[PDB]
Structures are given as structure tokens and as C-alpha cells.
Amino acid sequence: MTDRYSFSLTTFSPSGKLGQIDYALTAVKQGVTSLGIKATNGVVIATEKKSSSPLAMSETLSKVSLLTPDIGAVYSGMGPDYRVLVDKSRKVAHTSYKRIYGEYPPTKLLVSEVAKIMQEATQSGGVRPFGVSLLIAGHDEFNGFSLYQVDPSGSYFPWKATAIGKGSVAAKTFLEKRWNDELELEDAIHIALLTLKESVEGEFNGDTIELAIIGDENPDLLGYTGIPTDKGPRFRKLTSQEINDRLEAL
Amino acid sequence: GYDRHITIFSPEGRLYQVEYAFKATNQTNINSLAVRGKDCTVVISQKKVPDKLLDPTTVSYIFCISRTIGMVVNGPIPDARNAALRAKAEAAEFRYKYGYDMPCDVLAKRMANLSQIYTQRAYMRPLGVILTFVSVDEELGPSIYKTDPAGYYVGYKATATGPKQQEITTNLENHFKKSKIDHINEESWEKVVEFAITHMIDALGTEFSKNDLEVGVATKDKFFTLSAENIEERLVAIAEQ
Amino acid sequence: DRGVSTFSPEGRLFQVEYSLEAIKLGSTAIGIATKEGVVLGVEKRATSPLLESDSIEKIVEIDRHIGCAMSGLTADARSMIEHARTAAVTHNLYYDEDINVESLTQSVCDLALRFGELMSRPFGVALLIAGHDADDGYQLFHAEPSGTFYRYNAKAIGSGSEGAQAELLNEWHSSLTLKEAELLVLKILKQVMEEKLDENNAQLSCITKQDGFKIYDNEKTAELIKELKEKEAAE
Amino acid sequence: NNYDGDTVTFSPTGRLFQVEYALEAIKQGSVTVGLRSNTHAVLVALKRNADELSSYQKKIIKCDEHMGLSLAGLAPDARVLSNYLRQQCNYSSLVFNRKLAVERAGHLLCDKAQKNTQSYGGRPYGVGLLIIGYDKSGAHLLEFQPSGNVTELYGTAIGARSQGAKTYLERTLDTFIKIDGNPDELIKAGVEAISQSLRDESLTVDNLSIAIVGKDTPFTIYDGEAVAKYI
Amino acid sequence: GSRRYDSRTTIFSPEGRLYQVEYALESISHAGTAIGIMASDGIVLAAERKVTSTLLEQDTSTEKLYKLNDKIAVAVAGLTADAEILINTARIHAQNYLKTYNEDIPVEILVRRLSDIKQGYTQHGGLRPFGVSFIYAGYDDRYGYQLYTSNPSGNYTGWKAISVGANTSAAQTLLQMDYKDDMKVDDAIELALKTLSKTTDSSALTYDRLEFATIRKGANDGEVYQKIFKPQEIKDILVKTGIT
Amino acid sequence: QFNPYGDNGGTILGIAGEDFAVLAGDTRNITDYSINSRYEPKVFDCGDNIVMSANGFAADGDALVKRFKNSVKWYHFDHNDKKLSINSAARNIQHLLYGKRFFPYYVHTII
Amino acid sequence: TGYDLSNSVFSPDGRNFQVEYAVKAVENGTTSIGIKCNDGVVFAVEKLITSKLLVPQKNVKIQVVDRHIGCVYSGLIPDGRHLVNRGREEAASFKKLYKTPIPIPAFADRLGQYVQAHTLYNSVRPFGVSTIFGGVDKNGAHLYMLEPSGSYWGYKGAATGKGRQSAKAELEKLVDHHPEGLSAREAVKQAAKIIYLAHEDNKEKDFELEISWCSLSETNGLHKFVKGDLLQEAIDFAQKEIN
Amino acid sequence: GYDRALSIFSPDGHIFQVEYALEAVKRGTCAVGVKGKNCVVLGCERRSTLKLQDTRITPSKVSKIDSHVVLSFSGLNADSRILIEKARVEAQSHRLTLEDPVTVEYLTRYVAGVQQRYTQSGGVRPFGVSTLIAGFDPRDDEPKLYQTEPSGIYSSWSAQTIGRNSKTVREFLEKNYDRKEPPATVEECVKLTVRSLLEVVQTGAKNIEITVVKPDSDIVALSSEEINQYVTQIEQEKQE
Amino acid sequence: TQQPIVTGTSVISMKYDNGVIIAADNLGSYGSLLRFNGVERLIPVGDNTVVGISGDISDMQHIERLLKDLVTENAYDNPLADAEEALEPSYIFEYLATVMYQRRSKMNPLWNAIIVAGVQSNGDQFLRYVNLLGVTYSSPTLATGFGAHMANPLLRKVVDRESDIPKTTVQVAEEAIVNAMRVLYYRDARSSRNFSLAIIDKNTGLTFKKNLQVENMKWDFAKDIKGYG
Ligand SMILES: [Cl-]
Ligand SMILES: [Mg+2]
């Protein structure tokens, strides 16, 4: 046995293209649409729960994941690749940051760590790149609210608002017309739901849409009282009912 | 064209080895079904013993992973037993480290994560199997979680796997459209097994003897498989109404 | 591509057979064994007149009782010599004696097939190992990259080998003197060399029981070249 | 064809071409014969020279006082395998105060050769061996092939033109098995057997190599004027 | 076995070129242009962000210009992710040197170290090289203000003015024409922007498409300041030099 | 605490003549005040006309002799059945003994 | 195409062609069988006499694992030996940790997982043997047959090698004509017959019969070779049935 | 670890990776070495395709290995740094254990040994570099000049050149260098080295580097103006 | 390095004309506590060897498992496992002796003293000792622990040198051993009345006697002993 693939499976072609990264981006393009919008007092990330069978319980599949109490992530592309990245991203937030500084990492630095993991799958021996693009939303005391995109190559960019996957080109044009620097969080959620309706074919409701925010601190979700400086997570996943309420005012 | 031999991306963003592992899944020509009751989770699978020289008692694709978790496999037996031994090891290690029985959905995730690694690392091939895990979880109740060669998994109200999965899937879909509930509203597991067998008969259009089926039942704190005579009693009750 | 340790359909290792071709391109080396000593001689083959020919070291001492001459990719020989010297000295440390010439040759030849996917390829150099011990007297061995070694009364390796070996076939007898053997090496080297043989583009050496392994001075070889010229003009 | 690049690849008919190519190296090697009675076991080997100035390549290797082999094929591979046998014979003596059975020696050689046929990177051994020995169950002769297959025999031959010596032994089976307590007559039968594989060349004093092991006879090799008696 | 699938990233061509290095350089030629200009009283680093969007958050963005320590900065051309791996290595190397000698790392020593890391990926390991070229702008008390470049081969050279990335041929001709040895920072700022404005593939050069940085002894007395320009400060220097 | 050494007593004597040599030793093996054996051979024929005895701790003594006998066997294999001379055997034993310099064979050896 | 050049590569069918090519080496080998009897198991094998120079009864093919398990195989003999060596290590570690001798189904999975592991990577070749094995444990007699893929099942009777179709037919008759079961001594006789009948596929060269058995009553649950009078009795019974 | 055999034999007995490493040397800028009666001079070409270069800080072509030995090269610049580092470490290691600086032959033998090792080690390619190593042995006034190449062969030279158009400058040296009477002074040796480069260089401006090494660790690099005076004097004698 | 915990006391043995006898009591002591009264310390290997062990019982049980595994291993691919290639006493001893010396040399000894008694293929008597240090020796009589001090003197009166072995019958030899076991019961504080005895004869094979008791004990004279002076 032994892993005898100690060599790179991603190489430069004569034209300077890294084939496997380009092909990973093609896999991302086929994936279901996800988006993110940044408001003055928050950030929203959203995607369609494309259920593979109606017998499947799509609540058990989480496309929007908590990484830290103040940072959340969504994806487009290969779901299993996303799941293992979320596991690795949660762990690296602790090992390379919280166990050292006693606090959760800021959004940009956790993104930096995820990016690093994705870069290494692009150069290390005997592996293919990750077939996902991530949208990571988060808050931290000194940088405030932020939204980042991370691609298969490991490259990352900050966004006011963006979309990835299937209908990203059309969605990004929709967001350009609606986005301004004076948006409140509710306005951004409203725009997120309007944008996502365009890319969805079938049912459009709280059970087929997954949507989460990075907003105010939720002391009700902390699980304990008695420490004034601990005020709770800023990440909150919206319920099926909370989505449907905002679909009547749509 | 070496992008079809190992798990690297094709120009279309596809992993052909993963797709071909899905095709290996149906090599046994066996169909499985899983459903949830109020207090139980039932899994049934076709049993085919083509050779008279075989010991029919040793022919099985349903496995007892832990006391609480059962697993039915759709795919070749070597890969099935590979996945089984590993799942058993993982469930035992979990209990030792964390002090409680590994939940069905957590084991599914773990095995799915292992399957994901074979789709990303070149030296390891995917296993040509679909793993359906069943239990009565102490937190979530009756549970069906299924894993495939892509590393995908999800929970199910009910499910079906094999060459004729679509026929069984639609049959189950239509039933749950009528009842408007997420389970079989029945007290005893015996009647939930009778439901599972009846609806497989209707979907496949074939009759079954005691030796043509294989049944696994998950209740609170134990998963067990039925003997041929326990199945015979089940078949007699179906025929008498 | 294909394995480095692969067998051909004829039952030969491709890489070993190819290394033998590299040795055919190398400069000529000749050895002749007598009852009075073993003589070793080489063609230096300087690529340009500005190259200081005395820095071309194709004859090398392993121990006082064992010499060595090389032909082929001579850079590959350095680690083989290092190993030989170490084996010779190490055995003297362990056993308070000189090592047998055969045992030394065998130790060198054990390295030869340690290649795969250890070193990445066989050695591209053949060695003539000459020496004396008490048990078997004056000996000459031919160590290949296959791991095989043959003992020889006389042997030529390198680009002029098959022509030289045919000449050694006729000229060698069991009563040869050391002086006769020195002239015979010079004669056959002069025959197969491209350039005209002199003391600066050819080198002699020997191994005797009394004096051990000695590389000849250019002045000493020059006299033996003049002695050769006169005795060929004598008939 | 497409399935001979390495030892890890079966062909469509279930053949291992690298192993078969290694088997071919044996057929190119010089002839060697093995035969035994109930009391003694004999190896006879035709040594091969490079030319008239060169020595004749040694074919027989001693492994212990009671065991040794003859080779045909790649001589360095014989050195590797015989060294392994020397160690196993020696381990048996040091640890268990026990002379290694010839049958068990065969089993160890089989398993060593097998590992090189199932793994990537390596290569099969390119040599065939005839192991003779005298142990607690009498005289023995073994034939080792680098496929892994080891076989116990009354007599055999391997190398180029070995079929002639093998047929002779197949005829003489009933005669030479009965040569008990007569080492010289058993060697005579081995020399007469190897003679059936000669063409153009004949058995000279530095050409022939003989070994013997028996009841009260340690494994000993005869070369040079010690074999002139049998020419 | 596995040999079948090996690209062999560290071999020579028949002509004696390293395939992967050459192809990595081809990749870098499509990346945004980065310029470095060295003056007597400082160094300028200018770089063009690649075809941006109106929805990109520019003030918190950094793809081109990175700080290695207080005295040394780099401009990046190529794969951003690859560059960050090397950048973090370089930042550690600088701190290792500071801990050991209690002095800031000389610029060349840092450049040689990174360049040696790149060299290794071309000679051993069977991995693809880093698809990154750097411009290093730095100061130390031995050689003063220094500009270097390094590329995927691991070769590095020193410069008075240099470009990497897209349109280096056109950019290097324009720099060669207008550069003088007695030049000052304010003039070098203007030259860097004028060069980018002429070589750009975009229709016009605006503040949102640029990253800009200076290393000046314009720091109060006998010390060196690094200034990474803010979006509004790039907008002001574009109006001052008469480009917008 | 575990003591890995012991004392098995015994006495040995070597004398070199003009064209001969003798190596003698008593056959008594002991621990403390008990006799283990009245006849436990201590001087051994090691082949190549060499006799050896390693007196002191009998386990280490038997180990050393066993390893030297083995060294003679492998000398024959590795060097074309050459006779191991007494001086060469002596140098070889030095290396066997010094190989355990930091956990010694607790014996006085004579060949 | 190219899917058959490397082990562990799925073809577009979902097949591992290298494993299927290993089966061809198995099919090329000599015939070997297994019969499950009332309180035990019988193993038999065809040994081709290539030459008069082969010493009769010496080149033993059937192998014991622990003291209660027999193993026989057809195909590449060295691969079988390698698998048995592993089986011996597995049975040794099981007994070391758990005290009791390894149960047969437990032992079956140990071989199964090891063979299956040689279909997971291109750095290794699949096994070129089908192995018939079994014995007696606390739950009674067990007979197994294990393929190059790692696949194994329990059997009433089993057969592999060049004469497998012939043998299988003969085994199927025994199953039908004896639903109550077969005695150990009967199974030895029947095993001899089946090898002799299966020798028609290898009729060019003559052969040597080799039989072994584990029986609760006849061998105390230990693996033994059939020798002497009992072997000759089974040869005579076999020779009478072919004529 | 990556074990792949990149340097292997071909059917005609050639190791192509070693031969292609020589082709990289052919592409490199010309380097020349000439030894006089009491000195050695190392000349090196600088390609003038690169202006706007900072010559203060740019890696210089001649590198000191110790205070008494220098190394110049032709081929891959990045590869040369690895050999120079290893050589510098070995030079200090030799001083530390033998209590004497390396001979020029010893240092050459070491560097050549490294080059050879990279032609039969798994996972590695050969160095695309040939070197000229020059200097004086400790307490010795005899000049030393050696050459190495990717294969790992080495040898001593009265005068030698390597790199692009080295065939031309070797032609010049073979007719202009007399062994019975080598350049007696520093001037004569530098003049012959500049002359040899002027056969190939283009402009005699910032394209020629000259480094003079004398006995007892006396090493100096000539400036632009000093070299420019040699360039001036050569062509004025040529106009005749 | 350890300390022995549960321990077995003397093993005693001797040669006689046609074979060897070995014996050992059935006690496992836990310091001064006579904890385990049914421990078998003579462990037969085949029908030609008996290994008697004293010292640490856990280490004995380990050695017992090594010998069990040695028989299994010898039978593998060995058609003559019950005949010419059966395990000999000399093979079993040398293996143990190797292990004992290797274990002391890693400073982690098997805390035992072992006697291997048996008969060889050619009928020769085999009797040899090995202990935790790897020390080995042979003698017409051998004994461990207290047996060395008390049994050997009594057994050496029967067989004093080699020439006394053919003159000693199996009846005389067994008698001597049984008397020695009684003496050890009188005088060893960590011994028991119950013991096992094994005879290995070149003609009659291996006879293994269990549940033997020390009998014909003299205690009556105790009644007359009064005070301490
Ligand atoms: Cl996991
Ligand atoms: Mg894979």
C-alpha cells in the first residue's frame, strides 16, 4: 500500500492554466445558487434547499453552517466537500486561534485559514482541489460586519453583496441595482429573498429556502446568564415561519 | 483520458470514478426499503440465493453495527463488509471517548466524511456501496440516514435503494401524500414490518416466500434481524387480510 | 512511463543493459595480471588542450594492496571508490589484516543492483579492480553495473575493448614478466586510441606484493613508451 | 503487451508477464543438474566463462553444513536469496538449536519471492535455484522458481538445454535412487545426466562444478583438479 | 501503479528549460500589473487590481500589496493564495532573524530565503511551483532603499525600476525612458501612475482599480515609514498628478 | 531492584608453548554458596584451531562464545572459507566486547 | 478504455477488471473442493504429476491454520501461501487477546477484509487464488469459499479451479440426495470421487489425490490429513466409481 | 516522499536529464577563467537586455566560498545559490574539523560530488549549472582553476570558459594561451581575459565583470572604469 | 524491572537409566499468604518434554502460552510434526533460554527459574536449567529455589556423577524425588503438601501424575518437646 501519489495532480498547462482549478470552478457553476448581502447593521446569507427526494428530510441537511458564534458560511458546488471544509474550519478556529488568544478569530482571518486549506489541495501530493465556492459572513469588534467569497484556488475577496453558482451572473446584476450603503438588515433580507426567487424553479417557501443572518447579539441563545461581557451569538438561522412572514410582505 | 481512472475533475466538473462507483452499487441486483413507525424503524431487503451449494444462513446484506444501530448495504459484499467493520469500529470508539452511544445520524456523517476523502484523495478508490443506517435514536426518535459513494448523506422519512428504487420510492411517496404524516402510525413493529413488505410487494409486483426476504428492526435500545420463521409469521398475517 | 527495475522479454534488466552502452562510450582501460604483478593502464582523453591532463584521475588507490581503473561515466565511480576504501579499511579494523581482493570486489558489486523507486539508477561505470593477497596471489577483476564480476588474466573495457581483448587473447601467457606486461598495455592502448599515445594522454600503474599500488610518473611512462617504439622498429 | 510494464498488473488471461520475463532469465542461464538417493544428494553445474582469459562463473553456494544450492540466471539475485537462506538456517541453529528442514527452507524462499510479485516498485527475482540438503528426514532436492513455486523432486535440471538432462533422469529414476552408500557412483550419474545437455563444448577441469551432501558428509564443493576424476 | 499519472513537474525539456516554471511565468503574464520604482528619498509600489466590480468592498480589500515587516513590503503578481503561503513564511523568517540577532532582517537575506523556497519546488518534491512573482520594496542600514523581484524559478534580481505581471514589455520601455537616478519620491509616484495609465487594458485608470504604497524616510527624523494608501488617498493622488 | 548480572565462579588458565597452546578450566558452576553443576564445560572448540573461554557471569559468557562461533561461520561464508587466524579472531572479539561497552559482557575472556 | 490497466479503477460498468483478470488465474489452476458434513468438513485437491521425478506425497498443498482450520486453494500457489500466512497471524492475535481459538466466521472475515484491501489501491495486485477453508468451532462445522474480490459466503459444498463445473454438479447431487446430512467418513469417500471425476478436465497428465478433514467425532475437532489405509480406501472407492 | 527516478539511462546509454541540464548551462551567460603565473582571473558576461537594474544589490556572478577561493557559474541562477551555500558550509566545516582551510581541489571535489548525487537520487533533477572554481591553497603560491558540470565530472584547467558562445572563447584561448609562458603579471592576465570576452560580449561597457584572485586571500573585483581602460587599450591596438 | 507477586517455589528433577523425572508443588504464594492451592507448574510439551517453572506465576502463564504457540507453529506446513520433525527437549529449552536472556538484556526479565526435562530422539536423557538472568547449566540432578539447597544433596547421593545414571532405576529415582518433596514440605515455609510428578522414559513415554501428597510424615516426636530451655 502506502500513498504513492506524492506528486501534484494540479499542474500548469502550456497556456498557464491550472486545469484542475478551472474544472473545480466548472463544478461550482453547476451547483445551486447561493448569495450574500451586507447591510449597515448586519449580513445575510441565503441558498435554496434543493431536496434530492421528497422522502428526504431536507432539515437534516444544513447548507448554511455556523463556524463560530459570530461567523456563518454557505456554499455552491459539491456538498460533501463543503461539509468536511466546515469541520476543518470549525476546528482551525479553535486550534490556531481560540486556544491561543482566548477569543474567536475575526472574519477575515478565519477566511484566511479556510483559504489556506483550499490552496493546499491545489498544490499538495495526490489530491484534487475542493469543488466548492464559499460565502462567509461574519462580525467582529474591530472590523465590524463583513462578507467574503472563497474559491477552489484559495483566493478570497470581500463583497458588499454577491452570488455564486447556477444563476450568479443574473443575480449579481439584480444586486447591483438594489444595493446601497444605507440598507438596514430587514431591507437586505427582503432583497435576498427577491434575488433568490429568480433562480428558484419550483416551490418557494420557508421549507425550501435556507437563510441565516449575522446581526445583533442574541442573549436568549447563549444558554447561560451571569457574565455581562458575554451577550450571545450574532449568527442566527431564520426559522421556516420567520421566512414565510417576510414572503407576505414581498 | 486519465481523468476517468482516478478521482480528479473532468472538464465538465465531474468525478467519473464516483459515478462508476454508483453503478457498482446495483451489481447485486437487490432492492432495499426502510420505513419509520411510532416507536420503531424497519428495514427490509431482498435475499437471493442462486446456488444450491451455498449456506443460505451466511448470505446477508443487513449488519448489526452497534446494539442500537443497524445497517443495510446496497453493493458488492466485500465493500459492504469493509464499510461494516469500519462502522462497528467507529461506533465502539465513539462510546469509549464520549461516554454515550453513537447516534445513527452521526455515524452516517462519519462514514460519509470517509467516503468524501476517497473522492478527493487519489490513492484510495470509492467503495461501491450505499449504506442505509437505522435506529431509534434517544434524542431524534426513529431515524433513517443513508450514505453514498459521493460522500452525500441525509435523513429520510422513508427510503428505497437498488435497481428498482424509483418504483418503491413513488409507491412510498403516494402513501405519505395521503396520510400527511412523516411515519407509519402503528403501535407494534410487527405491523410496521407488514406495511414494509406489503408496499414492496405492490411496488415490485412480486410475491415473497420466507426465504426471499431479509428483515431488520430497530426499537429503543436494540436493533435485531428476523429469522425465516419470524418472517413467515409476517407473510401469513399479510395473506389473511 | 515504465519501471526502473523492469525486465525485458529476453530476461534482462533494461536499465542495466542501457548502462552497459554508456560504458562502451567511455575511455579505454586495460589490466594485465602476471605472477610478478598486475598492471593497470588508461586512456585519459582530455576534451581540450587547455585542460591540465594530470588532474584526470581514472586510476585510483583503494588500499596499499588494491588498485582500481575506471571507464564510463567516471563521476559515478566516486561513491563506489569511497565504499571500497571504507570496506577495505573497516575490514582491517575488524580483523587486523588485509582484505581479500575478491571480498573487496564483491562488496563493491553489492551496491550495483540497489536501485529502484536507494539510488534512482544503476552506475554508468565499469571498474577494473587489481590487487594481491596471500591466499590467491595477483588478481584482476572486472566489476560491472549488473552486480556481476569476473576474474581475468587480462581485460580491456571502454570504447576500444573488443579490439583490445582480441589482442590480449593472442599476447597473454602464464610466464609474462611485469616489464613485458607494461609494454603490452602501452602497445594495445596506442593501437585503440584516437590521438597519438604519449605520457600526458595515457597513464600506467601497477600493484606488486613488495611495493603495493603505485601510479607511474609521466617521466617513468615516457621511458617505457620510448622502449616500446624501439622494440617495434627492431623487426 | 500493455500488461507487462510492472509486476502489479495481471493480463486479461490472468498472466503475470514480469514474472514470466524473470522466468526467461533462467532459460538463458547455464545448465545445472540436481539428483539424490536415500543417503546422498548431488548438485552438478556447468560453469560459464566470458572468454578464454576470464574465469568460469561460480554456480554453487553453500548455505549451511547440511544445505546448499546451485543457481541459474541473475547471479546477484542468487547471492541475495542464498544470503537469506544462510540467515534462516543460522536463526534456526542459534534460537532453537535445530538444523533447518529443507522443506521449511523451500517455504521461506517461496514467501520471500512472492512479496516481490504483488507490490508496486519492486521486481521479481531473476534466478532459479536447486537446493540440496540432508536433514532429519534424509536426503532432499528442491527446485525454486522466482514465481514463488517450490517443488521437491528426486532429480531435476534448470537452465539452457536442461530438458535433455531432465529426460535422462526420468529414465534413470529407478537406478540412481538406489545408489545408497556410494557417493562416487551418484556423482557419475549426475555427470552423465548433465552430459545430455552439452552441445559443441565438453566437460573440462575448470568447466565442471560438483557438490555433495549426505549421511556423514557435510556440504562440500568440488572444483578444479578435484573433479578430473569424474571427467 | 501510481507512476502512470505523474506529470513530472521538476524535469528539463530537451532545450534545458523547466516546463512548469515557464508555464507558471505564462500564468503570471495575465495577472494585474505591479510596478516598483526606487528613488533617492524612498520607494514607490503601485499595482492594478484585476477587473473589479462596483459591489467589491475596496477599503477592506488587499490582493496586491502586503506588509512583510515595518521596513519591507511586497507587490504580488499571480495566484493570490499561493502568494499568501509564501508571504506568511517570509513574515516568520523576518521575525526569526529579529529574535536571533536583535536586528531587523536585511532586505536581500529575506529575498534570498523566499527565492530559495521557490527554487526547491523546481528541483525536488514532484509538486507544482508557486505561480507568483514578487516585487520587494525595502530598507535597511547597509544598502538603504532596495527593489528586488523574484519569480517561480527562484531567481531574483535587483532593480532601480521594474514591473511584473501583464504588459511588462511595454511598461519596462516607458520606465526606461523617463527614469533618472536623481529622481525623488513624488516624481516616482507620478511615473508609476503614468506608466500604469498607459499600459492598462482597462478604458481608464480609477481609484477603485488601484492599490498604492510608499516607503519613505519622510518619517520624523532618522526612521522609515510604510504607507499603504487608502481609497480616498489614491483618489487624491490621481487628481494631483492629473490623471482624473 | 533488578540486577542483570551474576557470578558463576570458575577459574581458567591459558599457556602458550613453543609449537602448542593449552586452555584449561575447572568444570564447577556455582551461585553464592551452592553448586549448580560439577561438570559444566567452560572451554570451547570454536573451529579454525581456536579454543575460547569467557569466565565470570555464565549467561554473558555463553552469549559471547555463541556469537564468536557465529562470527567464524560468517567469516567463512564472506571470505571464501579462509582460515580465521588467531590475531584476527582476537581483534574480532574486541569489537564484540566493545559493542557492549556501556552494558558489558561481565566476563574475562581468553582464547 | 485503459480501465483494466490499473487495480482499483472502476470501469464505466462499475467493475474492477484487474480482479476479474485474477479470477482467470484461479480458473487456470488445479481443481480443489470442500464438503461440509454432519459434524465437520472435508477438503480435497488435485495435484498434477508433471513428471515421474516428483516425489510422491511430498509436495503438500493443503495447509492448516491454528489447529482447527484447513485451507486449500486453486490458482497461483504462492498467493495462497501468502494468504495462509496472514490467516495464521490473524488467528494467533485473536487467540492471544481473546484466549479461545478463532471462530470460523470470524476467521473468514479476517481473510475477506485482507483480500478486499488488495482491491482498494493500484500499488497492489489482487490475489490470484480462490480459497476454500473451514473447520469446527463452538457453534459447529463451517465451510467457506473466498474469491479474489474479497467476496465469501458459507457453503454446503464448494469447488474451484479448472474442473469446478464438473465438481459443482456432483456436489449439488449430494445436497439433494442427503438433506439429513453426510457423515465424515462418507464425505472423504465422496471427496475422492469428485476429484477423480473433475480430473477429466485435466486428463492429459495423471495426478495425485490429497484429502484432509476436521470432524468433531473422527478428529476431535482438529485438522488432520487423510493417510494410509483410509486414503487408499477412498482411492479404491473413487476408482470403482469411474469404471 | 517523492521517489521518482527522473535521471535514467536511455537505450543508447545516455542520461537525458543530465544532458538537458548541460543545455541549460549553454543558455547561461558566458563565464571564463584564466590563470597567470601568480594569479587567477574570473571574467563574466552580463547581458544588457536588463537595464534599469540596481547593480549595487543585484546578485554578483562571482561568489566567495571562503576568503581564498571563489566560484563563478553558467546556467540556472537559482540552482547556483544552492551549490554556493553548500560549498560555503563545507568550507567552514573543514576549517572546524581539520584546522585548515579547504584546498581548491577539495572544494571542487565536494561541489562536483553534490552535482553527481543529484543525477542518481530519486525525486530530484540535476543542477542546471557548471562552475569555475578558482583560488590558492593555504600557504601555496601555485594558481588553481577547476571546472565542474551537471554530471559531476571535474578537472583542472590552465584556462577555461563555460556558458553561451563558450565554443568561440575557448577557440580564442586555445590559440592565445601559451602553457610554457602563462600571463606573467596581473595586467597581462586581466587583458587576456577581457580580450577573450570581447570576442562574444557586444559592448565593453557594463557587460564585463572581472575578479582577480591573488595568493594569501587577496581577492578584489575591478570597477567599471578600470575594466573600461582595458577595453579602450585593446581596440586602439586592434586599429592596426 | 519488576518484582514477582504470585510465586511458585522449588522445582526438582533428576536423570535415571532410561529417562528423567521432574516434580513441583501445586501452590501459588502471595508473599507469606498461601493464596492459590491448585496451580499446575509442570507443563508438558508433546509426549517427550516437561517444562517445570518456579517464580512469578503471571510470567509462568505467559511462558505456558509461548510453548502452546510453539507447538501450533511447528505443526504448520510440517507433515512430520508427529514424527521426525516433532519438537525436541533441546529445541524447547534453547528457545526458552534465548527468550530469558533477551528479556534480561532489555532489563525486563521473566522472573522465573525453569527446568526442561525430557528424552531426545536417540533416547538420550535431557535435563537443563535456565533462569531470569539467562544463566544455563546441566547436571545429573537439578533443582530451583529451596530445592537447590535441600533436594540436590539428597538426589546427589543417588546420582553423584555421570557413571551413576545407568545404575539408577526408575523406582529408586522416583523414591528419591518423593522423599525430597517431603523434606521440602518440612522445611520450606512457602511449600504445599499437594504436588505433581512427571516421568519421561525412553521406553514407556510420558507418565504425568497429578494430586500426589506428601505422606509417611514424622511428627510424633513433637509431643516430648517442651519449652525452649
Ligand atoms: Cl469525520
Ligand atoms: Mg480516489
Residue numbers in the entry:
A (entry chain A): 1 to 250
B (entry chain G): 2 to 242
C (entry chain D): 1 to 117, 125 to 242
D (entry chain E): 3 to 233
E (entry chain B): 1 to 244
F (entry chain L): 1 to 111
G (entry chain F): 2 to 244
H (entry chain C): 1 to 240
Sentences from the paper on this structure:
Thus, the main compounds 3–5, which possess the complete 12‐membered ring structures but contain different aliphatic tails, were investigated for their inhibitory potential against the ChTL activity of yeast CP. As expected, compounds 3–5 showed strong inhibitory activity with IC50 values of 27, 73 and 107 nM, respectively, which are weaker than that of 1 (19 nM) and 2 (4 nM). However, the electron density maps reveal that 3−5 covalently bind to the β2 and β5 active site Thr‐1Oγ and develop hydrogen bonding interactions with the oxyanion hole Gly47 N (residue numbers are allocated on the basis of the alignment to the β‐subunit of Thermoplasma acidophilum). These prearrangements facilitate the Michael‐type 1,4‐reaction of the Thr‐1Oγ to the double bond of the GLNPs, located at C4 in the 12‐membered ring system. In contrast, GLNPs have the highest binding affinity to the ChTL active site at β5. In addition, the P1‐alanine side chain forms strong hydrophobic interactions with β5‐Met45 and the P3‐threonine moiety is hydrogen bonded to Asp114 and Ser118 of the adjacent β6 subunit. While all these interactions are uniform in each of the bound GLNPs, differences between 3−5 are found in their individual aliphatic tails. Comparison of all three complex structures may explain the distinct ligand binding affinities to the ChTL active site: The aliphatic tail of 3 is engaged in hydrophobic interactions with Pro94, Tyr‐5 and Tyr96 forming a hydrophobic pocket in the β6 subunit.
The eukaryotic 20S proteasome core particle (CP), a barrel‐shaped multicatalytic protease, represents the catalytic core of the UPS. The CP is composed of two identical outer α‐rings and two identical inner β‐rings with total 28 subunits that are arranged in α1‐7β1‐7β1‐7α1‐7 form. Three catalytic subunits β1, β2 and β5 present in each of the inner rings confer distinct caspase‐like (CL), trypsin‐like (TL) and chymotrypsin‐like (ChTL) proteolytic activities, respectively, with the active site threonine at their N‐termini. Given the vital role in many cellular processes, the inhibition of the CP constitutes a promising target for the treatment of diverse diseases.
